Structure formats: C-alpha cells, structure tokens
Amino acid sequence: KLQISNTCPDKYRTKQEGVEYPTAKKITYYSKVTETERKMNVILPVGYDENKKYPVVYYLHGLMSYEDSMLEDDSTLAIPTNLLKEGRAKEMIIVLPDVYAPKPGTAVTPDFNPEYYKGYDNFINELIEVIMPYMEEHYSILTGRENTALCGFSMGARTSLYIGYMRSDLIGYVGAFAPAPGITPGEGKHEGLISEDEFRAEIQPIVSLIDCGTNDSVVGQFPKSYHEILTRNNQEHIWFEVPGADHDWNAISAGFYNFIQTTFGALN
C-alpha cells in the first residue's frame, strides 16, 4: 500500500520544467462568523472543467502570513500535480483559508498564547458555516467526507486535528504537520480544548496523518504526544518523523507529500 517517505524528494516539491502547475486566485468574501470581510486562496486544478466535479483539500496555515502562507514554498502547488502525473494523486481543488477567525469584537494581535489561539479554535465555525458553503455554491465540487480533506501546519495542524476528529462526519482525511500544543492539557500552560480520553471520533478518519521534524524548536514533542494519545485511544493514524528537521518546510513538504498520496482513494 502506502510507502511512507520520511523526507520529501525534491522532484515532487519543486516545479518541474515543461510541466503546467495550477495557480492561486484570491477570493474576498463576507463571514457571518467573524462579521468581517475575509480572504482565501482557491487553487483550481489544471484544466478545471465545470462539467466535472472535484474533491477539496483545505490547507491551514499557522502563525505566518494568513491565506498566502502556504504559497511561500512551491511544495503546495507542486506536490499534487507532480504526483498526479505518475497516477499517484487525484485531481483536486486546494483552498488556503485565513484561519484566524475570532468572534466579533475579540480579535487580538498574533501571540503564541491561548487567547489568540481562540480565533483558530473558532475556525471550525468559519469552515463549516461559511467556507464550505462558499465552495459548494461557487465551484464544481464533490461533497461528503470521502471528498473532503483538511490539513495544516503548526497552529493550522492543531486546528486540522481538532476539526478532523470533532467533525469526522464531514472530514475524511486529516493531515497535521508539526501540530502545536493544546488540543489536550499540557505544559506555557494549556488547559486543553478536550481531555486526552476525549481525543477520538465515533467515525474514524479515512486517513489521519501526523508528522514532525525530530528537531522542532517551536512545537517540540507535542506532535509525538498526540501520536501517543491517539494510539492509546486506538484512533489509527500514520505517524512519522522527519530526521533532523526543525519547524520548517522540510517537515511540511514531507507531510504534504505523504498526505496527498493518500487522499481521495489515490492508492485505490
């Protein structure tokens, strides 16, 4: 079945000569959840045909530079196309949200702190009440958990795990690349979104995947702790480490490379 690569080969995370890659279009929309105008990038597949329907991956940034964050390295645009060429991924639509979606009147400046993190926690409502309906009503998409993936980096990865397990009925594929502390209680001090024994779902993700560099200076051993908790709870998932990598694009690209090989039935 799947052969997990601890490191992403350069050929897949970089744009190859003579290959066409998809492009991002920035969408401005209104959110009834934040009561503000917001933005997201939508990346349609090459040769997008409105007479076909496509599965969707939502890819969540961490504390970086909002919806453009995951375009800073070419792995996001390159990996799905490069796999597709070898028959190793499905055609898909990629959405890059602005994940910081605080309730009205509660926005604070970015801080590695639970108060700022509340706006990431609220993204569950932005995704389900605003962005998913936006995508269904503006693009030719396949709906349902078998056609819906959610992945992210750092605070975006914590948020992907949280939404992926709390709403596994909507999300079939969950990818967490170096997830941040605080889904569960841990030591600043995180009181936890949920208890360790609560970190599970009544319906399993089709694929759940977590990676981390072995030298991550920002989230440390918290991804491994999530691996350990999910194991204790028999929530099957893929866990792997990226040798020598820090909180960086080597860890992210290895995560996205392995994740996209699994999404939407690509392994058959």
DSSP sequence for 180-214 = PS-SSSB---B--SS-GGG---SS--SEEEEEEET
- Asked if the 1-268 domain carries CATH number 3.40.50.1820, the reply is yes
Helices vs strands, H then E, count in the chain: 8, 8
Which residues pair with residue 212 across a beta bridge?
A: 241
Resolution, given in Å to one decimal, reads 1.6
Breaks (C-N over 2.5 A) in the chain follow: 187
Report the structure determination method: X-ray
Angle at Cα 262 formed by Cα 179 and Cα 166, nearest 5°? 45
Angle at Cα 149 formed by Cα 147 and Cα 155, nearest 5°? 165
CA distance 209 to 259: 7
Please say whether the beta carbons of 201 and 174 come within 8 A: no
Torsion of CA 137, 43, 26, 156, to 10 degrees: 90
Which strand ranges, in their side-by-side order, compose the sheet holding 24-31? 24-31, 36-43, 93-97, 56-60, 148-153, 173-177, 207-213, 238-242
The maximal CA–CA distance of the chain, rounded, in angstroms, is 51
> Which residues does 87 contact at the CB level (< 8 Å), separation at least 6?
none
CA distance 212 to 239: 9
The two structure tokens encoding residue 138: 């503006």
What's the Rg (C-alpha) of the chain? 17
Domain locations in the chain? 1-268
